[PDB]
């Protein structure tokens, strides 16, 4: 009806009692602009609205609703790819909106219809240190934790390069046979940054292939959370109907979150544990909801979020709570990046937990999971001697941990270290595990079946 | 015997001494740093459901 | 009868809701979603709706059922997957034609298709009849024809009527019992509220050891069916592998496997995996599955059924008790319905005050563990039934301090480590003997000593080798190595030993589909004696070095243990780990002279 | 007669105001079902009741309530003994009525006649390590600060099982003229404990010395912190007028305080530190009241709380508020479990402040107290002596230490360990520490005077 | 109308809505005594009022109310040099009756005339250790920052009695060209140091060109926060109308702060990080902006605040949020208390902004800057490599690093040591500092020019 007040950004409507939930209802301000909102929340006698267009306008008297009727759905083409959007899919170019074949609903709670078949075959992202240790799966999520005093949107951005360059020695491996297509989603990321995406992109040749969906932070809070609902339900909607390898790669999850915690400071519901939501963890769950083997079990959606960590703990809020509802994670790290390396990854808290069910040796070899599992125990030896070889001199130092000190520098500044244009092969990944392994006698190795061993050693 | 002796306890001496105006007391500050911010997270929290 | 007052997130609130109770099962909207009155203020009462919102208005009606939410167990459980709200996934994926569950689509809790073959229980008519007594049993599957349909817990009468064996459907009464007036008729199906203890004829104190399968979990301190255990997690370090793992190993006549809170991808994985891999109990035809009940939900699905996932788990595992089944009830992860927990007590609105975490937190995780424990089953002709609870803690925010682990630890008696270092190094499930207790070994040791082993004296020794030497690892680091007595090296050696051959074993140890406690006690048997003697040898004079190069061949031979399995001596027993001790007697001969 | 609400455990009845504070009121179901509950406040035309057996469940118009008119007391009885109770104080024996011999309160206090006169005369639990190098006399509070890294109910159980068969030999001595009574209270307790206690009594023939409070962890939390309430005002009568001196064991005080952080979830009231209340202080004194030298001192009571710290914590705030409190403190520590020694009471930071006040002679001797300052001292050092000889090694250790290492094995193994069913009497445990500090020549002992010295070495 | 209610020291009143902001009532109790407040809040048909008398003791319809119909303002004059108050401006020891000449109300901003033009002349106490390494302008702010177990008073004392005999040194050299005059306000301190502030000003002769502000902490919370302001709006009364510059000691900042935090957590604001304010940076900001010259420039207000820290470390509230906004920090150290140095203002991290400002060259030399950088540098380095020296031996510690052991032994025992009647001079410092530089090598001194160091070494 009309706004009896405004509360922080969250507009309180006083309104008869009458609408849908999460309908959009449309607020007539007098300067020659109407905007949308959605009901956040419906309550007795009134409605609490955040109007996704602006934050300042709204009148108590010279304000008029009008209820469109119908909750907000997103309209899906699967001839969205080669196309600009904004948070709200309006053009910014004039001229491409996102048009419809189907209208499907933004949550994805409707549809679901997610196969009970177990991430599969192998997928790779072309930077050894990631596919050989943290074995990427189809329908497998995994996130990418970062940290900032780092180049971390270069790191994202060369995995934006890097996938659909990979599709190729994909095929050779027969752990794909189908399109590739990207779906691009930005959140509160730099100007600089967004022309950065732009031009990889169009570099690949699959600027056809992809959709940008492009929000800033001079765009509202309720509108940032939207943009990767409508993302990730186009990205389903390739997945399914057309069977698909569907690569939605979503960024920033922190200023995703960060969103979600301006709000709930007008609403009944109260903030839990160091002043973020309590349900902060179910609105997690609905953006990753849409990852793995679709049915029809030849498309998947395999989905790569990327997180900064903006405190640099892993035990703040916003990695926590993702890491869990995630099958294992990824570390960049600030160290690497101080010695000069590139990209910069340690491995050591690194660890995917269904890497070994999912990879065989047809597309990988048997030895993939074995050889990764030494490489893991001789580095974290590497690490402690490190420490220890600081504070009390090399009195501590035994012969096993001067030559994994020697292995530390050996694996990160030839094995981990590669250019931006670079993409591996994985079987070539597996002879350089071999050969940095080959400074350390076979008696000493346990992680590794002997018979195992024999054959590729 | 002696020249080695002589050249060991200087460095066993050296390790007593790091230790103990070093190492000790860089544990306690962290520690601290932490405890305080820590504290404050709870509190807050409970004056936030009060208002 | 009801309308809709406001509709907040998935939870609605609803004015005018009068003769109701605090756990009705009502259906809210136009939309008719299945949702439950969690708690009410004064008029308004506040619902938690298991399905989502999306389009759903105020001033919709709101109808009371006019009984509580309760759950369906009846027959064919086995060899079927199914939800927390406990809603059939299969019939769900033919008929709405999405896997997983659609918004305003309703489905039964049970199949209503199916067709059963009842045979009579031991009543005729005119019977005086109660509780958790056997009024027939149904072939459920071709492993196990043990389902016993009882008269429900808090029945008691006198059976008018009593079919004859045959065909019928588990909605075609067979059954009638007058108690004061007509009771109710009765069907193969029974119903149970989730939100109370299920009842029991008398709990019995646990002492019968179950196996685990895993030759670690039973050697340091070993798992007994009635129990309570909590394994250590991270979420990135295998904890999926070995809970999976656990349950085909792990050999009980029932075992339910409930997905809290979960990936999707990991409970899709078990789904895929049971009818592949085959049962130690000679199962056939979908093996695994026909012994397994199955509870499935997904972290993204609504937090609902989530909180509902762990009360309907334990109430199967209770009914097949009843019966006279032992159970194993695997819950992975109890950390994950505790932030479902968290979650409802900031979208109702209620107070958390367990470090940012529920009021009612550390009680309710309390009260789905005393559901656990072995028993004498339901019912007066006696059978011994028993459920052990494995649930899985895992991180909350810290290591071990979040609120989860502390309340847990309180009120488990069983506890089993598993440390991230080694972890990541692979040497998982990692047991240490600090992070580690159980309660129940006495009682346990002296279980075995009846058995045959002389288990009590190997556990000892077990604990000394591992205790001694993190506090010689302790100097070692800080001090470094120039020198460590002759005594203490022996203790590391050995340590690591029993780190490669127990310790780490997950798809490394050729055998271990099911480790006899026999093979275990040989196999830690050689381990101690070799110690001993070693010790020994370096007191009577002899060097450590020599005593080392002439051990040798025997070294060698324990360190590869691992690998083998039972095919000499017994079933259980084996030769090679015999023949093994003696030999070590003839190297301590050459190596002290 | 008509429920307005539950919130949480706190449920809101709405009927009048005309009911006092704690006066217990019924909640009639249409389920047959009764159920009690007691007010914890009284407010205009409403209440607000916590009830003991469930806490939801009730109907908002079927349902009725009714008044008792009597505020909570316990009928206390001597002839109520040697029975197996809930946490309500009701048999679960399935024996005969509770009995009455008065009503007494068991809010707090019910007469409060705790003396202003100090502990002297022995209380024997047993167990060598806290009788000899601690020793209590009667009305002191000392607890027990174990882990759950210990098994900690096993060693609660150890105290009382053996206490109460010190007292023939007290009694021919003449430590004691009157009798010996035992008031034993489990809290949240596992059905396999519960039963354990019962077990392990009847085994002894220590049952009918006892009487057992079983409150079972499926009861909610507002039951089980009134089952140490009921315990210790039945202990007072016993003191008090029939003179006994009785030895009160309460496990587990972790779950009682957590019960109290617990409730509060529609109060006004804010919790301190930790999420535990600021208030934590005068929930803990409140078990701490009843405890102390009855009026007419012969008879006593005597409380040992059991405290377990769920993460090895004693910064944790529950330790540290008792332990200001309290007249010293027993440490536990999981080390010596791990060696093997049961039961592994570490005396390295355990101390009695009124160690000197409680002994004397006729179940003490005189020479109790320089041995208890050779033993600890001698102890400490043997610790300290491991440590060198890992370093040094045996062949080159010092002939002061090796002495002190000898001493640490056998005082861990023979004074501290004791079987399951073996009794250490106070004069039985004094000969045993003789041989251990045989070993040092006179020119080492020294805290000890010639006197002694010269009789036993 | 009358009293409603008090919760805390604030007071529930009603009465209309005719006063204006900080508005004085009048409070008639029936006990004989008036107490007067002044608004804090005005709401519809109510007010809540902080009382500066009495913080209890007020009723319902016992107390009533009239209102003054004036809102608070200081009678601020210059005829108040040499006459005593407390903290409310009246007199405990029987001086002059504050009479009035110009009325300004506080609010931190009188007349606000405050810089825009920056100080450059030069003021000394005689004290080395604060003059060369913080050069302190004519209207800069510099506070002292000690910790528990100083004797912060006794600095304060040093500066107090030593200025007012320097000065007029400084006069000639045109350091100055005017009279010097202290305004003490001290809040919350006890009797015995608030006489030894008053003794001080006796035994100098500088007792008539003092103004004492004594409160006590004992005197209600809200008269404790008006001191530092009352004190203020004097203190430039004095330098607008007789152009002295005016030095402001306001001590204690930590009994400042607990009274703005029990009026933060007993207000219906939410307060900042450690339970201390939200705007407690805000009522902090109130006194520091009342510094620079003022109007006719050659009057100024220049401020030393005393912070002790209450809990030792420069991580708590206090002690960054004054230092972010005043222009430096002069530090004491416990280390140097403990060894016999007095004053035992450390040297390490002791910092002004405004330092190049503050030297000049038409009464100061030029070379106090250049050589000032030295100093701190060398000291700093000095300080470290004797920590250094503790944990190396004389393994890693050169014949150059000796050098610098010696310039630190040093500059401790005469830069810093001397009396606290002992006068120096800015040319004698420099000559000093230059002596005790001299060992290093020219090589060594580097971060000052060849020009300068040829001549002076």
Same mark, same amino acid.
Request: charged content about 25%; glycine content about 6%.
């Given at each position: 009806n009309t706004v009896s007040g405004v509360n922080g950004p969250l507009v309180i409507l006083e309104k008869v009692k009458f609408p849908r939930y999460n309908e959009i209802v449309n607020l007539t301000l007098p300067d020659g602009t109407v905007r949308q909102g959605q009901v956040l929340e419906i309550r007795g006698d009134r409605a609490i609205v955040q109007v996704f267009e602006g934050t300042s306008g709204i009148d108590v008297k010279k304000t008029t609703v009008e209820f469109t009727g119908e909750s907000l759905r997103i309209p899906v083409s699967?001839?969205?790819?080669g196309r600009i959007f904004d948070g709200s899919g309006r053009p910014i170019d004039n001229g491409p909106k996102v048009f419809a074949e189907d209208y499907l609903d933004?949550?994805?709670?409707?549809?679901?219809?997610?196969?009970?078949?177990?991430?599969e075959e192998m997928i790779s992202t072309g930077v050894s240190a990631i596919d050989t240790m943290n074995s990427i799966a189809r329908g497998q999520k995994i996130p990418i934790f970062s940290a900032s005093g780092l180049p971390h949107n270069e790191i994202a951005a060369q995995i934006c390069r890097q996938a659909g360059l990979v599709r190729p020695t994909k095929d050779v491996h027969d752990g794909h046979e189908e399109n590739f297509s990207i779906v691009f989603a930005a959140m509160g990321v730099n100007l600089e940054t967004a022309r950065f995406f732009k031009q990889d992109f169009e570099e690949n040749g699959s600027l056809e292939r992809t959709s940008l969906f492009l929000n800033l932070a001079n765009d509202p809070t309720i509108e940032r959370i939207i943009t990767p609902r409508l993302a990730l339900t186009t990205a389903e909607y390739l997945a399914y109907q057309t069977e698909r390898h569907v690569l939605t790669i979503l960024t920033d999850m922190s200023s995703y979150a960060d969103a979600l915690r301006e709000? +709930?400071?007008?609403?009944?519901e109260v903030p839990g544990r160091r002043g973020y939501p309590g349900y902060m963890y179910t609105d997690l769950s609905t953006i990753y909801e849409r990852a793995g083997r679709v049915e029809g079990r030849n498309g998947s959606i395999t989905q790569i979020p990327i997180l900064t960590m903006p405190n640099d703990?892993?035990?703040?809020?916003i990695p926590d709570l993702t890491g869990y509802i995630t099958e294992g994670q990824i570390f960049v790290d600030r160290q690497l990046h101080n010695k000069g390396i590139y990209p910069p990854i340690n491995v050591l808290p690194s660890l995917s937990r269904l890497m070994k069910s999912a990879i065989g040796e047809g597309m990988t070899r048997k030895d993939h999971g074995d050889v990764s599992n030494q490489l893991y125990a001789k580095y974290a030896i590497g690490k402690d001697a490190a420490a220890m070889k600081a504070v009390v001199?090399?009195?501590?130092? +035994?012969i096993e941990d001067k030559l994994s000190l020697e292995f530390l520098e050996k694996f990160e500044k030839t094995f981990i270290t590669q250019g931006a244009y670079e993409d591996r092969t994985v079987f070539e990944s597996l002879d350089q595990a071999w050969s940095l392994l080959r400074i350390y006698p076979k008696e000493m190795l346990n992680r590794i079946s002997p018979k195992i061993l024999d054959e590729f050693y | 015997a002696f020249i080695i002796l002589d050249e060991v306890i200087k460095v066993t001496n050296r390790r007593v001494n790091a230790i103990e105006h070093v190492i000790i007391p860089r544990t306690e500050n962290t520690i601290a740093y932490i405890n305080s911010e820590l504290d404050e997270l709870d509190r807050e929290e409970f004056y936030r459901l009060k208002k | 009868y009801g309308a809709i007052y406001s509709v907040s997130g998935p939870v609605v609130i609803a004015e005018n809701m009068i003769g109701c109770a605090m756990y009705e099962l009502v259906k809210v909207g136009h939309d008719n979603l299945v949702g439950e009155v969690i708690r009410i203020d004064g008029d308004k009462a506040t619902i938690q709706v298991y399905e989502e919102t999306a389009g759903l208005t105020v001033g919709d009606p709101v109808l009371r059922t006019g009984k509580p939410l309760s759950v369906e167990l009846g027959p064919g459980l086995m060899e079927t997957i199914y939800d927390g709200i406990q809603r059939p996934l299969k019939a769900i994926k033919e008929e709405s034609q999405s896997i997983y569950i659609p918004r305003g689509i309703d489905t039964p809790?049970?199949?209503?298709t199916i067709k059963w073959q009842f045979t009579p229980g031991k009543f005729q008519v005119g019977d005086h009849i109660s509780g958790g007594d056997i009024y027939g049993s149904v072939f459920e599957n071709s492993l196990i024809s043990s389902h016993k349909i009882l008269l429900p817990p808090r029945s008691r009468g006198t059976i008018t009527w009593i079919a004859p064996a045959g065909e019928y459907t588990l909605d075609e009464k067979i059954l009638e019992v007058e108690f004061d007036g007509k009771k109710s008729d009765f069907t193969l199906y029974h119903t149970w509220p989730v939100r109370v203890p299920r009842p029991v004829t008398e709990k019995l104190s646990a002492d019968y050891p179950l196996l685990t399968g895993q030759r670690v979990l039973d050697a340091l301190f070993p798992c007994v069916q009635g129990g309570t255990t909590c394994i250590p997690g991270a979420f990135g370090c295998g904890k999926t592998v070995i809970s999976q793992s656990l349950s085909k190993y792990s050999n009980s006549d029932a075992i339910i496997y409930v997905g809290c809170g979960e990936r999707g991808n990991e409970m899709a994985e078990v789904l895929m995996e049971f009818p592949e891999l085959y049962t130690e109990m000679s199962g056939t035809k979908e093996p695994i599955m026909k012994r397994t009940t199955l509870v499935a939900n997904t972290s993204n699905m609504p937090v609902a059924a989530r909180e509902a996932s762990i009360y309907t788990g334990i109430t199967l595992a209770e009914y097949f008790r009843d019966q006279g089944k032992n159970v194993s009830m695997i819950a992975d992860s109890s950390s994950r319905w505790a932030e479902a927990l968290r979650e409802i007590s900031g979208r109702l609105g209620e107070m958390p005050a367990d470090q940012g975490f529920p009021a009612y937190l550390g009680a309710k995780l309390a009260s789905f563990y005393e559901r656990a424990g072995k028993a004498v089953a339901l019912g007066s002709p006696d059978r011994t039934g028993s459920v052990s609870i494995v649930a899985a803690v895992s991180p909350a925010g810290g290591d071990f301090s979040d609120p989860v682990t502390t309340a847990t630890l309180g009120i488990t008696q069983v506890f089993w480590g598993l440390d991230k270092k080694l972890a990541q190094r692979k040497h998982f499930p990692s047991i240490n003997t600090s992070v580690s207790y159980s309660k129940y070994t006495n009682v346990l040791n002296k279980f075995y000593d009846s058995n045959y082993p002389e288990f009590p004296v190997l556990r000892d020794r077990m604990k000394e080798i591992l205790s001694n030497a993190e506090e010689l690892e302790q100097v070692v680091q800080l001090v470094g190595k120039s020198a460590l007595s002759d005594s203490d090296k022996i203790t590391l050696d050995v340590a690591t030993l029993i780190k490669e051959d127990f310790l780490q074993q997950n798809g490394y140890s050729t055998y271990d589909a099911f480790c006899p406690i026999w093979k275990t006690f040989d196999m830690m048997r050689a381990f101690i004696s070799y110690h001993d003697e070693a010790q020994k040898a370096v007191a009577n004079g002899a060097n450590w070095s020599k005593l080392a190069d002439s051990t040798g061949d025997v070294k060698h031979a324990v360190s590869s243990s691992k690998f083998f399995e039972p095919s000499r001596g017994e079933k259980e027993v084996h030769g090679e780990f015999e023949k093994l001790l003696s030999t070590m007697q003839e190297r301590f001969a050459e190596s002290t002279d």
């Open positions: 699967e001839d969205m790819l933004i949550n994805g709670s409707p549809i679901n219809p997610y196969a009970r078949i177990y991430p709000v +709930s400071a007008a609403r009944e703990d892993i035990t703040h809020p001199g090399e009195e501590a130092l +035994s | - | 809790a049970l199949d209503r």
